[PDB]
């Protein structure tokens, strides 16, 4: 019926309802200041319910996340942006804003040590340094990796040498015996000794840490604490940047930071006025994050608002596993479909099914149940065109994305010389 691609109908019975772009825009418009999603103002209550932007590469995920960041800043919200090539940084970065990039002159000095405040914070952040294993077996090695990491990094802290270079030496360079000796006195003293199984466990933990820690070590150090930054209202915005050719090298470090924010907001003091955004341009690009799940379910009070991008259902599935991936996607109440490749009929089907069906009375009438949006309609979407379906009881609408231009108020990258 105009805003509905299929045959017009006489009466809408139940299910997903689709409305015109403008019609939606008036429906979601509210008294208070709001952020916009592809020109449509986002319902204030849908913000802490999170947003998922699914779409093939080049369809407008950037234009959209850029606009969402912009309107959020104009309202004065704070935010963390996993920002590739410092694009968002060059457009919205102010002078009081933070930068995390081991190769950027302007980056702050950091070590996970800087986040430890209580004893339970050791495993908490070991979980962030060493993300979840892709497979059950890889997770088993990871757990030994965390054991070795936490007990070793704990002792180094005790003995006044919370050195990352030291922790790395111990965990991956020192001989098996030396390490064993250093571990004496720690909960790990006996756990990694006594059988071939125990030695194997230690070897596995070594390999893990040798894989995860490199970047953390070469990370410029300082006293910066993501925890303290979150608690500081006058703290700026955090931009996690990196050059694309190094994406794979920094995957474990960047996932570390993203996870740190995820656990940390759970510890921030009860503050109703806080509004923190978490921008993860490509969710399936980070490692299987340990705390993301809880952050997406218990971050309302902290005022957490997560926006994530995805392309094919198989990407997240491969990283988190099918079961765990479904749960992850399910935690984003608000969805945006940007149209994908016709070569990916499975995700187009998944997106079509998510947008949902409606039961209509068409034209002796007739009741018909049909997809509001056909997989084919998603496959044939032109660029900068999106279907916006906000959390809760709202109708969805096909809306165009407009490319607004933003001036570069800072260099995206600054060589670490």
Name the minimum Å distance from CB 226 to a second copy: 14
Select from 64-72, 104-112, 229-237, 343-351 the region that touches a second copy (CB under 8 A). Answer: 343-351
Q: Could you say which of 39, 220, 345, 411 contacts a second copy (CB under 8 A)?
A: 345
For position 60 contacting ligand GNP by CB under 6 A, the verdict is: yes
Contact (Cβ atoms closer than 8 angstroms) between residue 70 and residue 279: no
Contacts 24+ apart (CB under 8 A), 153-156: 153/112, 153/113, 153/122, 153/126, 154/122, 154/186, 155/182, 155/183, 155/185, 155/186
Q: Could you say which of 252, 375, 398, 399 contacts a second copy (CB under 8 A)?
A: 375
The single-letter DSSP state of residue 109 is: P
Q: Return the closest-CA partner of residue 43 out of 61, 21, 27, 54.
A: 27
Which residues are within 8 A (CB) of 139 and not within 5 positions of it... i.e. 6 or more apart?
A: 132, 133
Select from 67-75, 108-116, 122-130, 397-405 the region that touches a second copy (CB under 8 A). Answer: 122-130
Size of the site for a second copy (CB under 8 A): 121
Which residues, 193 to 232, sit near a second copy by CB under 8 A?
A: 193-204, 206-207, 210-211
- How wide is the angle at C-alpha 344 spanned by C-alphas 350 and 54, nearest 5°? 55
Asked whether the CA dihedral 258, 262, 263, 269 is positive or negative, the reply is positive
Question: 189 or 221: whose CB is closer to a second copy?
Answer: 189
Name the minimum Å distance from CB 274 to ligand GNP: 14
Contact (Cβ atoms closer than 8 angstroms) between residue 42 and residue 69: no
Greatest alpha-carbon span in the chain: 86
Residue 62 binds: one of ligand GNP, a second copy, none (C-beta under 5 to 8 A by kind): ligand GNP
Question: 235 or 321: whose CB is closer to a second copy?
Answer: 321
Residue 3 binds: one of a second copy, ligand GNP, none (C-beta under 5 to 8 A by kind): none
For position 286 contacting a second copy by CB under 8 A, the verdict is: no
Which residues, 30 to 59, sit near ligand GNP by CB under 6 A?
A: 57-58
Name the minimum Å distance from CB 63 to ligand GNP: 4
Residue 61 binds: one of ligand GNP, a second copy, none (C-beta under 5 to 8 A by kind): ligand GNP
Q: Return the closest-CA partner of residue 132 out of 242, 256, 306.
A: 256
Residue with tokens 């049909």: 370
Which residues, 84 to 113, sit near a second copy by CB under 8 A?
A: none
Alpha helices per DSSP H over 213-274: 214-217, 226-231, 247-264
Which residues, 398 to 417, sit near ligand GNP by CB under 6 A?
A: 403
For position 322 contacting a second copy by CB under 8 A, the verdict is: yes
User: Could you list the residues that contact ligand GNP (CB under 6 A)?
Assistant: 57-58, 60-63, 300, 364, 383-384, 403
């Amino acid at each position: 019926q105009g805003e509905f691609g299929g045959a017009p109908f006489k009466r809408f019975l139940r299910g997903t309802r689709i409305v015109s772009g403008g019609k939606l825009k008036r429906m979601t418009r509210e008294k208070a200041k709001q952020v916009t999603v592809a020109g449509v103002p986002m319902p204030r209550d849908a913000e802490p319910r999170h947003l998922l932007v699914n779409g093939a590469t080049g369809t407008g995920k950037s234009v959209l996340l850029r606009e969402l960041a912009y309107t959020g800043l104009l309202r004065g919200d704070r935010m963390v942006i996993v920002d590739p090539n410092g694009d968002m940084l060059s457009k919205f970065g102010r002078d009081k804003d933070i930068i995390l990039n081991p190769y950027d002159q302007r980056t702050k000095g950091w070590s996970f040590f800087n986040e430890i405040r209580n004893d339970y914070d050791w495993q908490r952040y070991a979980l962030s340094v060493v993300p979840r294993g892709k497979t059950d077996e890889a997770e088993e090695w990871a757990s030994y990796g965390r054991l070795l990491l936490r007990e070793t990094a704990k002792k180094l802290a005790l003995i006044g040498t919370p050195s990352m270079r030291e922790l790395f030496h111990w965990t991956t360079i020192a001989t098996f015996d030396d390490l064993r000796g250093f571990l004496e006195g720690t909960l790990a003293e006996s756990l990694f000794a006594g059988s071939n199984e125990a030695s194997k466990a230690l070897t596995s933990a070594r390999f893990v840490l040798s894989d995860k820690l490199p970047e953390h070590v070469t990370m410029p150090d300082g006293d910066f604490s993501i925890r303290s930054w979150l608690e500081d209202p006058n703290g700026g915005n955090l931009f996690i940047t990196w050059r694309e050719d190094m994406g794979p090298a920094l995957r474990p470090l960047i996932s570390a930071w993203v996870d740190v924010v995820c656990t940390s907001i759970l510890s921030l003091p009860e503050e109703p006025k806080r509004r923190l955004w978490l921008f993860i341009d490509e969710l399936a690009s980070l490692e299987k994050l340990a705390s993301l799940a809880d952050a997406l379910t218990k971050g309302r009070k902290a005022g957490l608002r997560v926006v994530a991008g995805l392309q094919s259902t198989s990407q997240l599935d491969d990283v988190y596993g099918v079961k765990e991936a479904q749960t992850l996607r399910a935690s984003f109440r608000s969805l945006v479909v940007l149209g994908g490749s016709r070569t990916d009929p499975k995700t187009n089907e998944d997106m079509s099914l998510s947008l949902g069906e409606h039961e209509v009375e068409r034209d002796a009438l007739e009741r018909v149940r049909e997809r509001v949006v056909m997989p084919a309609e998603i496959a044939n979407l032109p660029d900068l065109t999106a279907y916006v379906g906000f959390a809760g009881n709202r109708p969805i609408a096909k809306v165009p994305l407009e490319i607004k231009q933003f001036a570069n108020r800072q260099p995206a990258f600054v060589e670490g010389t």
